[PDB]
Amino acid sequence: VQLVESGGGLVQPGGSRKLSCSASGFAFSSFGMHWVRQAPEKGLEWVAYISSGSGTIYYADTVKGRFTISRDDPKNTLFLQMTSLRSEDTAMYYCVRSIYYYGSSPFDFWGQGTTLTVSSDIVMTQATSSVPVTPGESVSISCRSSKSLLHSNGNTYLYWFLQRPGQSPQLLIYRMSNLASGVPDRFSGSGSGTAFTLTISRLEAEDVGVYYCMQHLEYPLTFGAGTKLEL
Amino acid sequence: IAQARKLVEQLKMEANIDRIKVSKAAADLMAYCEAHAKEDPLLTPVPASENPF
Amino acid sequence: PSWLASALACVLIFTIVVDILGNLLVILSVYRNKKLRNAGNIFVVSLAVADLVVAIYPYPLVLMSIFNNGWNLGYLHCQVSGFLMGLSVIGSIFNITGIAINRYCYICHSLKYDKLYSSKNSLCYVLLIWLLTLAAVLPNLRAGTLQYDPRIYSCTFAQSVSSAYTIAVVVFHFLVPMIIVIFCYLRIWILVLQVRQRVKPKPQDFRNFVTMFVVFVLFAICWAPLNFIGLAVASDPASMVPRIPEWLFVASYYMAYFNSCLNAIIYGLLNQNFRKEYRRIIVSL
Amino acid sequence: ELDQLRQEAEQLKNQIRDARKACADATLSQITNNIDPVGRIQMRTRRTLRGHLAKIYAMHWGTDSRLLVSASQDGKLIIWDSYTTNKVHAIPLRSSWVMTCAYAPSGNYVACGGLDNICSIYNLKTREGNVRVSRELAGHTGYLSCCRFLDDNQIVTSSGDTTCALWDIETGQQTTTFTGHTGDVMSLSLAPDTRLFVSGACDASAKLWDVREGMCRQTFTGHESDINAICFFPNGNAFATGSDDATCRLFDLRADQELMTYSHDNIICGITSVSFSKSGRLLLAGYDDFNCNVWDALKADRAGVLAGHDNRVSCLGVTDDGMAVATGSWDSFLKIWN
Amino acid sequence: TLSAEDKAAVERSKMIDRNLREDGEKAAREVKLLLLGAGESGKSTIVKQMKITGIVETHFTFKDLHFKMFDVGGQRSERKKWIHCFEGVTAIIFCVALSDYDLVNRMHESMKLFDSICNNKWFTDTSIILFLNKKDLFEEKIKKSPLTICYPEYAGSNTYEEAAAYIQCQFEDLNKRKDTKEIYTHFTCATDTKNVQFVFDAVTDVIIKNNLKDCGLF
Ligand SMILES: CC(C)CCC[C@@H](C)[C@H]1CC[C@H]2[C@@H]3CC=C4C[C@@H](O)CC[C@]4(C)[C@H]3CC[C@]12C
Ligand SMILES: CCC(=O)NCC[C@@H]1CCc2ccc3c(c21)CCO3
């Protein structure tokens, strides 16, 4: 799979810019696309979502109306038209693919991200914003939600992401229990409603970074502040 | 001549295998049916609380 | 005459019972069998509902009126029944037409049928048909042409009040929905005959006409007499109404009433898809 | 010469029958005549999976007892979500003539085959998102009857060439070929430990094979018509057998003889599919009477009738949880009864 | 109520159960056929004419019809146990060798096979397209050898036209459900397109009758 996006750069406030993403190596027509920005120093933030077949489209309240998203199935290309860009719109716009069915793993693969520089809801809070760690240790990151995330059907909508330094986020655990494909079995998620833990066993190099917790119970999608790890 | 030999060999080699009494087999089947009867949602109508359909 | 009233009452009771029977069986047939939920069978359902809508409220009212020899009800109770008779007598005839174009399509322009008559297209076509029926029935309230006729004992469409509206009703409840049906079924029969003759190179050939064309054009026979009487009384309402005997008038109004169940019979029992499964309905119900 | 060998085979069969008679002392009805009847069981349909546009021929549950795969002649096999009646996947087929389907115990693969002589393998857990054909297992010269997964790397298939064959998914070549049937194999059931399997053919015989070496252990005879369905007892020491004689028969692996026959004077049509319950107390048989009959597997009494289908019930399966049974018929409908 | 993912799941399961509708519509519009007959009865020649391992599927578009075709004789197994798979086929193309009436007799096996096929429970309403093959060699074969050897209960002229007409009449009465199904018999016209044209005409007749029965106009 390969998600690469382009079209970023400098722009004057209130202008218009057209972000595009080139998707290859997978059935783009079946996957639902997301746009997730990340401020230069803040955490990640959901933007918009388009479903398979362009049926249902959702937007974040901060970008509703001003931002419109469209997809090009036969050319395997995703667009995000932006109108009236504001100062707070400067961020790292990632492109995320998500397939929704029974047993699927949404938000599995993430793009690179375009550099854009401009010159009611469930709120997530992470208890600790920085945990020093050492090789061979086992830490448990804690994340809390305003509302209990355990739905009636029994699926608790939590997602754990990992931000490598200067790289793209990777899904680790979806729905708090299920490990993503390609992720080592060291990680382990558990908890209950509004109380979530991520247990890392025998953590090693290429594992330090910032960890985000996601809710998919309802739109808009919100992330935690981000627990940052250092050696 | 090969087919008849193969059939004879197969019948001979499958003839000499251990048999149990039919009554013992019936008792074993009844014991299995009685032991696992409590965990059979088809036999006894499960209450709607535990019925996923 | 007592014999006249008795025969008219017998005609109405027969019509009511057979119409209710047929309409109920055909609606629950489509409700039961998934194979019968074809996009082409929606029009048959619409025709059944249209025929049934007077099989309950208005027909018993006029039956009691004959049994009472007088309008023993209210004014509003009269224009609410005339309105429903109008809806039935226009919706049934429009749904017969809709079925006509539907079948021409299946059996002729079959290559472009899947998209032209899809489920969404058929579901918006039946609603369009019903909207046309409602828009045709509605204007008589402002014209005040709905009133109780003592001769036939019904709050029916008065053919003498409005001339222009009568001739418009004539033109779109009998010249068009007859020409369309004639064209559709004649074309289907001709196409079948051509397909048969393209391969190999008589009593069954005639039988066929009898069971497609003649059977499905039976509706245009029942309304023809009173729908010509309407034109006659629209030509000169002052003098033509005394010039037409009440014999023809009543004989027509009961033929037109009988056609309301004739339609449910020819599109009901006369369909092998429903006929074969009718006996399953009786055992199940 | 060969006459001597034929006489030796005849006397071996005679002494085998004599040994089977000697071990026969009391039938299952005599042992269980003191048990209480299960009573009139009423099982009402809870879900109806629609979307197939042709007479279906196969269905198989997943090990999670929520996802089931069904195959029909419209060239499509669909994996359904039983709880919500959702079609998670729809995999087109190269050949629309499909007569069997399988769901891998891990759930990553499905198999299908038919008149095309190929038991195709499809990959579900693919990073590209779509379902791809992993391997096409060809070279079995006959219409396939029942593909069944052993693991994610092995599969057992039965064809109309009177031979069953254990394959290897990654190599594409059959590890073992089971021979001995003189009629077209039409059914196959795997033991719970995946160590043995039994198949039924037109010879009115069910042969108990062994996966390890391939020799046929026991041959069960007593039917008077071809065999259309086979299913083990949950204990794994017994298996039922459905045929065209309108008689389901329960066989014993250890006693090596027929145990009880399930017959009713009313039913005279064949049996297309059989199964069992979690406890094995009752077994469900799908007839051509357009209905499924629930037989008390310990008293040969018709416990109830699952009459909800308008055509012949091709196949039916019971979940691993034992919570529900899903039956499929030629009217292109799946009914989950409970 | 439904969650955010369950709504997307049902949207997926509604687009999947939307492409299936178009797939089924395409499958219904196209025409399916069967090939049956004795060994070396002329299946290969008709297949190669109309074209220009268990199932030899054949596709050929003619006059805007996909014309799916199945040659099943490749695989040898219980015919009665997969013949219900082909129920609902538009028509059965049956190939008969006219000149094979004397070799071992094969016309008796051909007529037995035709009787077995036409009287199946599944093939009740399915019309049968009948082809009579190798008539050219048949003419000289009956010029040299008498026809009475194949048909002892026969008395008539040994000319081509009369013999062919009698064979057609004899084969056309095997079916008992004469009212429901109709047999379209044809003599192959060497290397002309007339064979494919006749197949198209017969399948058009079957489709028209099936559509009439579906509408209830029958
Ligand atoms: C099959 C189609 C033509 C319908 C056939 C039924 C019609 C034509 C028949 C059946 C019963 C008949 C009616 C029976 C009684 C009367 C009363 C009197 O006023 C004479 C005419 C009238 C009103 C008859 C008119 C013709 C009639 C309505
Ligand atoms: C000349 C008209 C005619 O002969 N027959 C149509 C009269 C029918 C029968 C009863 C009724 C009630 C309302 C209405 C209509 C009718 C037509 C338009 O609105």
Secondary structure (DSSP) of E87-141: TT-SEEEEEEEGGGSS---HHHHHHHHHHHHHT-STTSS-EEEEEEE-HHHHHHH
> What value does the CA radius of gyration of chain B take, rounded to a whole number of Å?
22
Residue C219: HSE in the Cβ half-sphere, 13 Å Cα cutoff: 29
User: What's at D213, amino acid-wise?
Assistant: E
Give CA–CA dist D39/D304, Å, rounded: 9
Give CA–CA dist E194/E82, Å, rounded: 32
Q: Report the candidate in E178, E143, E184, E179 with the shortest Cα–Cα distance to residue E160.
A: E143
Give CA–CA dist E94/E172, Å, rounded: 12
Give CA–CA dist D272/E77, Å, rounded: 19
CATH fold, domain C2-284, is Rhopdopsin 7-helix transmembrane proteins (1.20.1070)
Q: Report the candidate in C40, C53, C122 with the shortest Cα–Cα distance to residue C90.
A: C53
- Inside any domain, residue E4: no
**What is the 3 state secondary structure string of chain B?**
CHHHHHHHHHHHHHHCCCCCCHHHHHHHHHHHHHHCHHHCCCCCCCCCCCCCC
Task: Return the SS3 of E57.
Answer: strand
Please check whether residue A62 is in contact with residue A17, taking contact to mean a CB–CB distance below 8 angstroms.
no
Give CA–CA dist D299/D262, Å, rounded: 9
Give CA–CA dist D209/C135, Å, rounded: 75
Residue C126: HSE in the Cβ half-sphere, 13 Å Cα cutoff: 19
Give the contacts of E18 (CB within 8 A, at least 6 positions apart): none
Q: Report the candidate in A208, A161, A157 with the shortest Cα–Cα distance to residue A183.
A: A161
Give CA–CA dist C45/C31, Å, rounded: 10
Please check whether residue C179 is in contact with residue C172, taking contact to mean a CB–CB distance below 8 angstroms.
no
**Alpha-carbon torsion D88, D92, D96, D101, what sign?**
negative
Task: Provide the residue range defining the domain that includes A6.
Answer: 2-118
* Residue A184: count of CB within 10 angstroms of its CB: 13
Residue carrying structure tokens 């699927």: A104
CATH of D2-337, picked from 3.40.50.10240, 1.10.3720.10, 3.90.1720.10, 2.130.10.10, is: 2.130.10.10
**What is the arrangement of strands in the sheet containing A195-200, beginning at the earlier edge strand?**
A124-126, A140-145, A195-200, A187-192
**Alpha-carbon torsion A69, A70, A75, A76, what sign?**
positive
Assign residue A20 the CATH number of its domain: 2.60.40.10
Assign residue E187 the CATH number of its domain: 3.40.50.300
- Inside any domain, residue E150: yes
Residue carrying structure tokens 């198209």: E200
Give CA–CA dist C278/C126, Å, rounded: 25
Chains D and B touch (3+ CB pairs under 8 A): yes
Give CA–CA dist D87/D50, Å, rounded: 10
Task: Return the SS3 of E10.
Answer: helix
CA distances for C42 relative to A188, C77, D30, angstroms: 55, 31, 58
Q: Report the candidate in D159, D163, D217, D158 with the shortest Cα–Cα distance to residue D188.
A: D158
Establish if D46 touches chain B: CB-CB under 8 angstroms: yes
The helix or strand, by DSSP H or E, that contains position D318, with its residue range, turns out to be strand D313-318
Same domain? For A31 and A56 the reply is: yes
Residue carrying structure tokens 């929704």: A100
* Nearest chain D alpha carbon to C33: D310
Give CA–CA dist D319/B14, Å, rounded: 34
Give CA–CA dist D145/D320, Å, rounded: 22
User: What's at C72, amino acid-wise?
Assistant: N
Give CA–CA dist E22/C115, Å, rounded: 10
Give CA–CA dist D73/D151, Å, rounded: 27
Bridge pairing between strands E91-97 and E127-133: parallel
The single-letter DSSP state of residue D33 is: T
Structural method: cryo-EM
* Residue C186: count of CB within 10 angstroms of its CB: 15
Task: Return the SS3 of C133.
Answer: helix
Which residue from E6, E13, E15 is facing A53, i.e. has the nearest CB?
A: E15
Give CA–CA dist C121/E129, Å, rounded: 37
CA distances for D132 relative to A27, D62, D120, angstroms: 11, 19, 10
- Inside any domain, residue E146: yes
Please check whether residue B36 is in contact with residue D282, taking contact to mean a CB–CB distance below 8 angstroms.
no
Chains D and C touch (3+ CB pairs under 8 A): yes
CA C129 centroid distance within chain: 13
**What is the arrangement of strands in the sheet containing A16-24, beginning at the earlier edge strand?**
A2-6, A16-24, A77-83, A67-72
Please check whether residue A8 is in contact with residue A79, taking contact to mean a CB–CB distance below 8 angstroms.
no
Task: Return the SS3 of E8.
Answer: helix
Give CA–CA dist A176/A182, Å, rounded: 17
**What is the arrangement of strands in the sheet containing D86-92, beginning at the earlier edge strand?**
D56-61, D67-72, D76-81, D86-92
Residue C105: HSE in the Cβ half-sphere, 13 Å Cα cutoff: 16
- Inside any domain, residue E5: no
Residue A138: HSE in the Cβ half-sphere, 13 Å Cα cutoff: 8
Alpha helices per DSSP H over chain E: 4-29, 43-51, 106-118, 135-144, 160-172, 194-215
Name the domain count of chain B: 1
Please check whether residue E61 is in contact with residue E97, taking contact to mean a CB–CB distance below 8 angstroms.
no
Give CA–CA dist E43/E39, Å, rounded: 9
Bridge pairing between strands D164-168 and D154-158: antiparallel
Atom of ligand 2 minimally distant from the CA of C226: 4
Give CA–CA dist E127/A32, Å, rounded: 48
Same domain? For A132 and A215 the reply is: yes
Same domain? For A173 and A129 the reply is: yes
Please check whether residue A122 is in contact with residue A217, taking contact to mean a CB–CB distance below 8 angstroms.
yes
Give the contacts of C150 (CB within 8 A, at least 6 positions apart): none
Give the contacts of C23 (CB within 8 A, at least 6 positions apart): C48, C49, C51, C52, C55, C264, C268
Q: What is the resolution of this structure in A?
A: 3.3
The single-letter DSSP state of residue A221 is: P
Q: Report the candidate in D258, D217, D219 with the shortest Cα–Cα distance to residue D240.
A: D258
Largest CA distance in chain A: 50
D68: left (phi over 0), alpha (psi -120 to 50) or beta: beta
Mark yes or no for CB contact E81/D99 under 8 Å: no
Please check whether residue D8 is in contact with residue D1, taking contact to mean a CB–CB distance below 8 angstroms.
no
Please check whether residue A60 is in contact with residue A105, taking contact to mean a CB–CB distance below 8 angstroms.
no
Query: How is chain C split into domains, by residue range?
Result: 2-284
- Beta bridge partners of residue A59, listed in sequence order: A48
Q: Report the candidate in D60, D6, D73, D36 with the shortest Cα–Cα distance to residue D327.
A: D60
Give CA–CA dist C19/C258, Å, rounded: 9
Task: Provide the residue range defining the domain that includes E84.
Answer: 32-200
The single-letter DSSP state of residue D37 is: P
Binding residues of E: 40-45, 71-75, 133-136, 190
Give CA–CA dist A72/D316, Å, rounded: 42
Give CA–CA dist D78/D86, Å, rounded: 10
Residues of E within 8 A of C38 (CB-CB) are: 214
Give the contacts of B9 (CB within 8 A, at least 6 positions apart): none
Give CA–CA dist E168/E199, Å, rounded: 17
- Inside any domain, residue E56: yes
Query: How is chain D split into domains, by residue range?
Result: 2-337
Q: How many beta-carbon pairs under 8 angstroms link C with E?
A: 45
User: What's at B51, amino acid-wise?
Assistant: N
Which residue from C40, C107, C274 is facing E212, i.e. has the nearest CB?
A: C107
Give CA–CA dist D250/D261, Å, rounded: 6
User: What's at D179, amino acid-wise?
Assistant: T
Name the domain count of chain E: 1
Q: How many residues does chain A have?
A: 231
Give the contacts of C71 (CB within 8 A, at least 6 positions apart): C65, C78, C148, C155
Q: Is A157 exposed, middle or buried (0-12, 13-18, 19+ CB in 10 A)?
A: buried
Name the domain count of chain A: 2
Task: Provide the residue range defining the domain that includes B42.
Answer: 1-53
Give the contacts of D323 (CB within 8 A, at least 6 positions apart): B41, B42, B46, B51, B52, B53, D65, D338
What's the gap in Å between C128 CA and the centre of ligand 2?
Answer: 20
Q: Which of A66, A96, A118 is the last residue of a domain?
A: A118
Tell me which chains share at least 3 CB pairs under 8 Å with chain A: D, E
Q: Whose Cα sits closest to atom 4 in ligand 2?
A: C227
Give CA–CA dist C51/C263, Å, rounded: 8
Give the contacts of D286 (CB within 8 A, at least 6 positions apart): D229, D271, D272, D273, D274, D292, D313, D314, D315, D316, D327, D329
Task: Return the SS3 of D72.
Answer: strand
